[PDB]
Amino acid sequence: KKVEALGEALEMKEAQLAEVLTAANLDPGTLAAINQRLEEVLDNKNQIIKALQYDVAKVSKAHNDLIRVYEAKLTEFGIPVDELGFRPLVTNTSTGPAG
Amino acid sequence: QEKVLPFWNGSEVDEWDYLNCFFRRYNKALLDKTAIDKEKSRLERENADLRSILKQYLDGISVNDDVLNNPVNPLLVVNNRLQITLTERNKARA
Amino acid sequence: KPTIVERYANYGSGTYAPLQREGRFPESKPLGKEIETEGYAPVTLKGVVDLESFLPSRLLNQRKEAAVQRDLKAINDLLDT
């Protein structure tokens, strides 16, 4: 039903766009170019949002895993004082960004 | 990607819904493989089209038995076959 | 040489920090056969509906038998008696 509601929103917005363009009847070239460069701006914004969210997740996981590995090495060596606490990570496993 | 987020983008757990995150990861892999299959499926057909156009182009240059056998060929024209075919292709591609 | 369970439980809480001295580097591919599937994922609803169209079947939901049947028939007759 959420998909249905979003489809209804898409349908009404598309119909509104069609009627607005058929009413304005402005020249294609310049107005189209306006459309493409702000479409590109929006696309780059979405892409960088996605990439930087993934960057946050990746750096947080590396941070937490490296904290655990240092704690393990120190407690193996017998250093009993542990200092730093883990950050709210969602995914824990062996991976690349450790060494 | 899935090495660092294998799960997504508080009571006890029942056995039926016990593996849902693993099924999420499985479904992610399935979707990626289906995308791979779609991309390939378009690539091989475009490659076949390129092979066909290349072959008929080489035929266009050469003087070959199949070139003569094709009744629509500039190398030897009878009863305006070539001209009729050209105007038909023009009206079909118009 | 530890067991797999011991090795996974030891480092961190389910991880492994390989020392650079062993030279076992499986977590990093040689970059020759590298894998990156992010580009293939659809960015438009056209691509989304096309992927939905692809593969709907998975989207939706002897002599030994004869010998065993003979043995079960005989034992059932014996139980009847």
Partner: peptide, 14 residues
């Protein structure tokens, strides 16, 4: 549990 699909893991008593 903690790696694949636990979401929570609890030791027994003894």
């Amino acid at each position: 549990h903690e790696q694949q699909l636990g979401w929570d893991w609890r030791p027994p008593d003894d």
